[PDB]
Amino acid sequence: GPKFPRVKNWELGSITYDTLCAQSQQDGPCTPRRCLGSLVLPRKLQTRPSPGPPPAEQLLSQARDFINQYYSSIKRSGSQAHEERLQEVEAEVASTGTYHLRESELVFGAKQAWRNAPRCVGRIQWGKLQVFDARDCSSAQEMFTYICNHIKYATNRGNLRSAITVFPQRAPGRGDFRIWNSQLVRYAGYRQQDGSVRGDPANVEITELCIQHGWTPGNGRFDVLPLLLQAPDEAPELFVLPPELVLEVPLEHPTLEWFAALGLRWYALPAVSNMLLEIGGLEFSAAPFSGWYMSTEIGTRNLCDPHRYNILEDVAVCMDLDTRTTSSLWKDKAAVEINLAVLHSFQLAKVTIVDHHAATVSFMKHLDNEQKARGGCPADWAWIVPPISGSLTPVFHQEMVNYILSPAFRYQPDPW
Amino acid sequence: KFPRVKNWELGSITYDTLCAQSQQDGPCTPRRCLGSLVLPRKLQTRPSPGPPPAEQLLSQARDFINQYYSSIKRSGSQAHEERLQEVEAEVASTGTYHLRESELVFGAKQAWRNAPRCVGRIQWGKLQVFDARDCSSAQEMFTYICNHIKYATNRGNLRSAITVFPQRAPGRGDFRIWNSQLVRYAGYRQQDGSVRGDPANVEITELCIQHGWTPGNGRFDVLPLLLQAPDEAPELFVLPPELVLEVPLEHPTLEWFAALGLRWYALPAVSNMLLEIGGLEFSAAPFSGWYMSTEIGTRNLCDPHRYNILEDVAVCMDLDTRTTSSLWKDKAAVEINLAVLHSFQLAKVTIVDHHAATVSFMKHLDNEQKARGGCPADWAWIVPPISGSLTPVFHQEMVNYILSPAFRYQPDPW
Ligand code: HEM
Ligand code: HEM
Ligand SMILES: NC(=[NH2+])NCCC[C@H](N)C(=O)O
Ligand SMILES: NC(=[NH2+])NCCC[C@H](N)C(=O)O
Ligand SMILES: [Zn+2]
C-alpha cells in the first residue's frame, strides 16, 4: 500500500491516505516510544520569544518556502515574478535581517494559518476571512482603535463575520506589539476571601494585572474586562471597551422557565488575542482573530468545566435531579439543557452560533474537500470531537493525522 | 526526555518516567501523531514463517522473569538466577520456552495493568486466571470457555477472568476463537443492502452459516462459537442458553421504552486479542470483566454503524428530529444510557456508569504514579463517548506507550 498514513472512517468503512503530512517542516511532541498527543501545551506547539533575530539561513529557508506556497496558490510557480520575489526577499534579509510581506501575501498566509489549525473544527469557512492589515499601527491607542473596528465589523450586530487584525511583526532590536488579554472579550475573575472565585476562574491573573494597572474592579460574575494593550518598549496601557460594542446574550431555556432567573449570559464574539501568527518565518505577536462560537464552547466548557463557571450542580438542583449519585446521570441531563439554552438564547437574540452536530458535519465536508485539494488535513482528534455527545457526531468515528504546517497560529509566552 | 503531564482541572503536575521502560514502538513520529488510529500494524502481532531469533526472544523472556521475581520481592535470590538459566537453556535448545503457572498469572494481570485503552484498570489485581494450556481440541476449548462464562457471570455478580489457551508454536497453526467476543449478536445481510441485528457481526455471522449454523432472524440472536485447533478448520459450538445472561432493557420513567424490545448480554468477553508475555504469544486468551454503561447505551446501541436506535427513541420521546439544534440526539442518548443502568441494576447484573468508572481511573492513575512512576493511557479511549468534559479524565493529560506483558491486536484467522 501507499507509503503514507492510512486513515479510516469506521462509520463509513472508507479509507484515505494523508500525503500532506509529508510537507510538515516542524516536529511535534511524539516519538515512536510514546504519544504525547493529549498534551495541551507540549514545548513542541510553542514558539519561545527571541532575544536575537532568526539566523538569516533558517529565516530564509522559511521565507523561500512561504513564497513558493504563495506563487503556487496563484499558479505562477517558476514564473519570473516568482524568482524576482524570492530574490527581493533574500536581498532584503541580506541587509536588514528580516523582510516584509506584500499585502496579498499577508492575506494568503493569514487564511492558510487558519486552514492549517489542527484544533479548529470550523475550518470549512477558512476561505472566508476578512484580513485587516494593521501593520502601520504605531501606538497602543491606535491598537485600541483597530481592535474596536475589528469588534464592530466582526460582530455586525449579531450576524458575525470571521476576521483577524494583523499588527506589526516582530522586529529585531525592538519590543513586541502585544495584547495581554487572552481574548478581546473576557469576564473578570475575582479571587475571594475564602479562596473561591467570583466570575471566570480562568481569567484570575489577567484581572489582577488590570487592577495592578489602574483598573477599578466591579464585583459581578459577568464583568467584561478592559484591554491591556502594549506597543513596542512601552509599558501596557489600559483601555475600556465601550459597552455598546460588546454584544452579550442573556441565557434562557425554551421550556424551563426558571433557567432565565439564573442570570447567566455570554458574549457573542470569540476573539483569541494571545496567539502568535507565523508566516514565512515572520512572527506577528499581536494578531487577534475571531469567528463565531460553537455552542459546546459556552454551554459545556465555559459554563460547566469544574475549573470554570461550574454550574452543573446548580442547574441539576433546579431540575430536581439526584445529585448524590452518579448513576442518575444528573451531570449529563443538566449539561444537555445548558447547551440547549445557549443554542436557544443565541437564535432568539439573532446572534450567529453553530451547534456541535452541524459543526462536525461541516468539518467532515471540509476533510473531504481538503483530501482532494491537499491530500489530507491536519486534525487534533481530542479537540475536534465535542466535549459532550462525542460518538453521536461523525468526527468521532473518523481517524485523524495531526502535524504542524506553516503558516500557523502558535502559542507564545505571557508578556509579563 | 520525561514528559511533564498536567491536570487542567486541578493544576497538578506529574512526570511520567515509566514510558522509559517502553521497548515497543507506537505509530507516532515527530513528523505526525497517529494516536487516534485504532489499529496500527505496530500493536499487531501477525503470523510468521520462522521462529523468533533467540536473541530477541531471550531478552524479552529475561526481562519478564526479572519483572516477575521483582514482583514477589525475591529479586536476586537463587530461584531467580535458576529460572533465568532454565529459560536460557530451553530457548538455546528449542528456540522457545514455557511459563510457570504463577508467572502466567502475574503476566496476565500485568497485561491488563498495561492496557492503555482500559478504563477499568483499578481492578487489575483482581483477575481469575484459568490455565487452559493443556488443551488439544476445539471441543476442549468449548468446555473451557463454558466454564469461564459460568464463573465470570456468577448469576449477575460478575467476576473478572481470563482463560489462556496454548501459546503459538513456530511449527504449527494457532489456537483461535474466531468470534470477536464469546457473546455477540448476529448480523444478517437483508437483501436491500441493510442489516438485521448487529452490523459489526455480519462477517462472523456469515462464517458460522458457512460452517453449518442454522441462523435465526431476530435482532438479538446470540451467535455460536467458531473455535479452531491448530491447522484444522474451525468447529461450530452453540452456547447453552442458560449460560448466556442477558438483560432486557427498560426505562425508569418512560413506560414505552420496554416496548422497543431492546436487550443486551451481561458478559463483555473479548476473544480476538493476542496476549504476549515474555516473548510468548497466546493467540487465544479470552478475557472478561463487566460493562461500563456507555459501551452499551452509547456505542453499541447508538453508533450509526451499529444498532443506530437514536432516531427511533427520539420519535418515541416525541423530540424534534427535524434539526440538530434541538439536541434531539443528545437527549435520546442520555435516556438510553439511563435505561441501561436502570435495567442492569434492576436485574442482578454488575455495571458501572462512566462517572464512577472515570473517577476510579483517576485513583488508579494516582496509585500508578507512586507505584511505577506513570501509567500508559490512550486519552481517546479513556474518555467516554458522551459527556466527555463532564468527567475528570477529560481534564487529565495522558502519555501513551507500549509496555509488556501486553494485549495486542492480531489478524483475523480467515
Ligand atoms: C468560523 C467559526 C469558527 C468556529 C465555529 C471555530 C471553532 C473552534 C473551536 C470549537 C475551537 C476549540 C475551542 C477550544 O476548545 O478552546 C477552535 C480552535 C481554534 N480555531 Fe477555530 N473556529 C472558528 C473560527 C476561527 C477563525 C476565524 C480562526 C482564525 C483565523 C480560527 C482559529 C482557530 C485556532 C488557531 C484554534 C486553536 C485555539 C487553541 O489552540 O487554543 N478559528 N475553533
Ligand atoms: C473490570 C471491568 C472492566 C471495565 C469496566 C472495563 C472497561 C473497558 C472499556 C470501557 C474499554 C474500551 C472498550 C471499547 O471502547 O470498546 C476497555 C478496553 C479494554 N479492556 Fe477493559 N474493562 C474491564 C475489564 C477488563 C479486563 C478483565 C481486562 C483484561 C484482563 C481488560 C482489558 C482491556 C483491554 C486490553 C482493552 C482494549 C480493547 C480493544 O482494544 O478493543 N478490561 N475496558
Ligand atoms: N469559535 C471560536 N472562534 N473559538 C475560539 C476559542 C474560544 C474558546 N473556546 C472560548 O470558549 O472562549
Ligand atoms: N468492559 C469491557 N471489558 N469491555 C471490553 C470491550 C466491550 C465492547 N466495547 C462491547 O461493547 O461489547
Ligand atoms: Zn501521537
Side-chain angles (χ1 to χ4, degrees), chain A residues 183 186 266-267 270 272 289-294 297-298 302:
Chain A
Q183 295 187 20
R186 296 255 71 187
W266 207 261
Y267 49 89
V272 179
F289 59 83
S290 68
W292 53 82
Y293 270 122
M294 167 178 64
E297 294 180 83
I298 300 169
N302 298 344

mmCIF file of all heavy atoms in Angstrom, chain A residues 183 186 266-267 270 272 289-294 297-298 302, ligand 3:
data_model
loop_
_atom_site.group_PDB
_atom_site.id
_atom_site.type_symbol
_atom_site.label_atom_id
_atom_site.label_comp_id
_atom_site.label_asym_id
_atom_site.label_seq_id
_atom_site.Cartn_x
_atom_site.Cartn_y
_atom_site.Cartn_z
ATOM 1 N N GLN A 183 -8.341 36.961 25.266
ATOM 2 C CA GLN A 183 -9.367 37.219 24.253
ATOM 3 C C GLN A 183 -9.763 38.694 24.364
ATOM 4 O O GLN A 183 -9.557 39.313 25.409
ATOM 5 C CB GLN A 183 -10.602 36.354 24.467
ATOM 6 C CG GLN A 183 -10.391 34.881 24.302
ATOM 7 C CD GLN A 183 -11.690 34.120 24.370
ATOM 8 O OE1 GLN A 183 -12.769 34.681 24.170
ATOM 9 N NE2 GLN A 183 -11.596 32.832 24.650
ATOM 10 N N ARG A 186 -13.620 39.106 27.627
ATOM 11 C CA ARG A 186 -13.460 38.099 28.683
ATOM 12 C C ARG A 186 -14.086 38.594 29.984
ATOM 13 O O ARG A 186 -14.047 39.781 30.287
ATOM 14 C CB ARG A 186 -11.977 37.862 28.977
ATOM 15 C CG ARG A 186 -11.151 37.291 27.854
ATOM 16 C CD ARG A 186 -10.864 35.835 28.101
ATOM 17 N NE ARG A 186 -12.062 35.035 27.935
ATOM 18 C CZ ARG A 186 -12.136 33.738 28.212
ATOM 19 N NH1 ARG A 186 -11.076 33.086 28.678
ATOM 20 N NH2 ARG A 186 -13.275 33.093 27.993
ATOM 21 N N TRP A 266 -23.513 35.201 28.126
ATOM 22 C CA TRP A 266 -22.213 35.033 27.485
ATOM 23 C C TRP A 266 -22.087 36.037 26.340
ATOM 24 O O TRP A 266 -23.094 36.475 25.784
ATOM 25 C CB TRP A 266 -21.986 33.592 26.977
ATOM 26 C CG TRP A 266 -20.516 33.255 26.943
ATOM 27 C CD1 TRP A 266 -19.695 33.290 25.861
ATOM 28 C CD2 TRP A 266 -19.674 32.985 28.073
ATOM 29 N NE1 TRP A 266 -18.390 33.085 26.243
ATOM 30 C CE2 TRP A 266 -18.350 32.896 27.597
ATOM 31 C CE3 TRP A 266 -19.910 32.827 29.445
ATOM 32 C CZ2 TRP A 266 -17.263 32.655 28.445
ATOM 33 C CZ3 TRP A 266 -18.829 32.589 30.288
ATOM 34 C CH2 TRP A 266 -17.524 32.509 29.785
ATOM 35 N N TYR A 267 -20.858 36.460 26.051
ATOM 36 C CA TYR A 267 -20.620 37.397 24.962
ATOM 37 C C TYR A 267 -20.726 36.684 23.626
ATOM 38 O O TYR A 267 -20.462 35.491 23.525
ATOM 39 C CB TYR A 267 -19.261 38.074 25.098
ATOM 40 C CG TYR A 267 -18.110 37.144 25.349
ATOM 41 C CD1 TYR A 267 -17.396 36.574 24.298
ATOM 42 C CD2 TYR A 267 -17.697 36.875 26.645
ATOM 43 C CE1 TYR A 267 -16.290 35.763 24.542
ATOM 44 C CE2 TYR A 267 -16.600 36.064 26.901
ATOM 45 C CZ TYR A 267 -15.900 35.515 25.850
ATOM 46 O OH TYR A 267 -14.805 34.731 26.125
ATOM 47 N N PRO A 270 -16.078 35.396 19.944
ATOM 48 C CA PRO A 270 -14.903 34.661 20.433
ATOM 49 C C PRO A 270 -13.681 35.180 19.696
ATOM 50 O O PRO A 270 -13.445 34.826 18.547
ATOM 51 C CB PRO A 270 -15.225 33.221 20.053
ATOM 52 C CG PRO A 270 -16.017 33.375 18.796
ATOM 53 C CD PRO A 270 -16.920 34.530 19.097
ATOM 54 N N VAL A 272 -9.750 35.269 20.002
ATOM 55 C CA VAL A 272 -8.477 34.905 20.597
ATOM 56 C C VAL A 272 -7.470 35.983 20.244
ATOM 57 O O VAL A 272 -7.294 36.324 19.075
ATOM 58 C CB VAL A 272 -7.999 33.551 20.086
ATOM 59 C CG1 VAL A 272 -6.664 33.204 20.697
ATOM 60 C CG2 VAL A 272 -9.040 32.503 20.398
ATOM 61 N N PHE A 289 -7.849 37.184 16.279
ATOM 62 C CA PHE A 289 -8.737 36.615 15.274
ATOM 63 C C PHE A 289 -10.070 36.259 15.896
ATOM 64 O O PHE A 289 -10.157 36.070 17.112
ATOM 65 C CB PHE A 289 -8.100 35.399 14.561
ATOM 66 C CG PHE A 289 -7.714 34.271 15.476
ATOM 67 C CD1 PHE A 289 -8.659 33.343 15.886
ATOM 68 C CD2 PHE A 289 -6.417 34.161 15.950
ATOM 69 C CE1 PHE A 289 -8.322 32.311 16.768
ATOM 70 C CE2 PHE A 289 -6.066 33.134 16.832
ATOM 71 C CZ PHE A 289 -7.026 32.208 17.243
ATOM 72 N N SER A 290 -11.113 36.190 15.075
ATOM 73 C CA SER A 290 -12.425 35.852 15.588
ATOM 74 C C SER A 290 -13.325 35.274 14.535
ATOM 75 O O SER A 290 -13.158 35.543 13.350
ATOM 76 C CB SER A 290 -13.099 37.072 16.209
ATOM 77 O OG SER A 290 -13.424 38.039 15.232
ATOM 78 N N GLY A 291 -14.268 34.459 14.989
ATOM 79 C CA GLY A 291 -15.241 33.832 14.119
ATOM 80 C C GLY A 291 -16.508 33.835 14.942
ATOM 81 O O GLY A 291 -16.879 34.866 15.490
ATOM 82 N N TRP A 292 -17.204 32.714 14.993
ATOM 83 C CA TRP A 292 -18.390 32.625 15.819
ATOM 84 C C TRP A 292 -18.280 31.358 16.670
ATOM 85 O O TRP A 292 -17.509 30.454 16.359
ATOM 86 C CB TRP A 292 -19.666 32.663 14.984
ATOM 87 C CG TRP A 292 -19.742 31.672 13.868
ATOM 88 C CD1 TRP A 292 -20.104 30.361 13.962
ATOM 89 C CD2 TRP A 292 -19.509 31.924 12.475
ATOM 90 N NE1 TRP A 292 -20.117 29.780 12.719
ATOM 91 C CE2 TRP A 292 -19.755 30.716 11.785
ATOM 92 C CE3 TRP A 292 -19.115 33.052 11.743
ATOM 93 C CZ2 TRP A 292 -19.628 30.603 10.392
ATOM 94 C CZ3 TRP A 292 -18.987 32.941 10.356
ATOM 95 C CH2 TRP A 292 -19.241 31.723 9.700
ATOM 96 N N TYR A 293 -19.010 31.323 17.770
ATOM 97 C CA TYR A 293 -18.965 30.191 18.681
ATOM 98 C C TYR A 293 -19.652 28.937 18.218
ATOM 99 O O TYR A 293 -20.567 28.977 17.390
ATOM 100 C CB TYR A 293 -19.648 30.558 19.996
ATOM 101 C CG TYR A 293 -18.746 31.149 21.022
ATOM 102 C CD1 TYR A 293 -19.002 32.414 21.558
ATOM 103 C CD2 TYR A 293 -17.646 30.438 21.495
ATOM 104 C CE1 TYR A 293 -18.190 32.948 22.554
ATOM 105 C CE2 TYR A 293 -16.829 30.962 22.488
ATOM 106 C CZ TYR A 293 -17.105 32.217 23.009
ATOM 107 O OH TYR A 293 -16.305 32.726 23.993
ATOM 108 N N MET A 294 -19.172 27.818 18.753
ATOM 109 C CA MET A 294 -19.830 26.538 18.562
ATOM 110 C C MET A 294 -20.401 26.418 19.970
ATOM 111 O O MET A 294 -19.677 26.602 20.958
ATOM 112 C CB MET A 294 -18.881 25.378 18.328
ATOM 113 C CG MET A 294 -19.639 24.064 18.474
ATOM 114 S SD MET A 294 -18.651 22.653 18.175
ATOM 115 C CE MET A 294 -17.467 22.774 19.502
ATOM 116 N N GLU A 297 -18.711 25.207 23.331
ATOM 117 C CA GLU A 297 -17.640 26.007 23.919
ATOM 118 C C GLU A 297 -18.199 26.786 25.111
ATOM 119 O O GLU A 297 -17.528 26.952 26.127
ATOM 120 C CB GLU A 297 -17.079 27.010 22.904
ATOM 121 C CG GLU A 297 -16.372 26.419 21.721
ATOM 122 C CD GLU A 297 -15.839 27.486 20.774
ATOM 123 O OE1 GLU A 297 -14.740 28.024 21.032
ATOM 124 O OE2 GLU A 297 -16.520 27.779 19.771
ATOM 125 N N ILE A 298 -19.435 27.254 24.972
ATOM 126 C CA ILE A 298 -20.087 28.032 26.017
ATOM 127 C C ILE A 298 -20.816 27.154 27.018
ATOM 128 O O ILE A 298 -20.464 27.140 28.191
ATOM 129 C CB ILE A 298 -21.109 29.049 25.417
ATOM 130 C CG1 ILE A 298 -20.398 30.023 24.474
ATOM 131 C CG2 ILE A 298 -21.799 29.836 26.539
ATOM 132 C CD1 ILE A 298 -21.329 30.866 23.643
ATOM 133 N N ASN A 302 -17.073 26.413 29.022
ATOM 134 C CA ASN A 302 -17.097 27.644 29.801
ATOM 135 C C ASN A 302 -18.004 27.599 31.016
ATOM 136 O O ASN A 302 -17.575 27.896 32.130
ATOM 137 C CB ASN A 302 -17.488 28.817 28.907
ATOM 138 C CG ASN A 302 -16.496 29.046 27.786
ATOM 139 O OD1 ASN A 302 -15.370 28.550 27.823
ATOM 140 N ND2 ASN A 302 -16.910 29.800 26.782
HETATM 141 N N1 LIG C 3 -15.322 29.734 17.806
HETATM 142 C C1 LIG C 3 -14.129 30.209 18.126
HETATM 143 N N2 LIG C 3 -13.584 31.152 17.374
HETATM 144 N N3 LIG C 3 -13.490 29.728 19.191
HETATM 145 C C2 LIG C 3 -12.174 30.163 19.663
HETATM 146 C C3 LIG C 3 -11.863 29.635 21.061
HETATM 147 C C4 LIG C 3 -12.852 30.200 22.076
HETATM 148 C C5 LIG C 3 -12.879 29.479 23.433
HETATM 149 N N4 LIG C 3 -13.148 28.020 23.250
HETATM 150 C C6 LIG C 3 -13.979 30.081 24.301
HETATM 151 O O1 LIG C 3 -14.932 29.354 24.652
HETATM 152 O O2 LIG C 3 -13.893 31.282 24.618
#
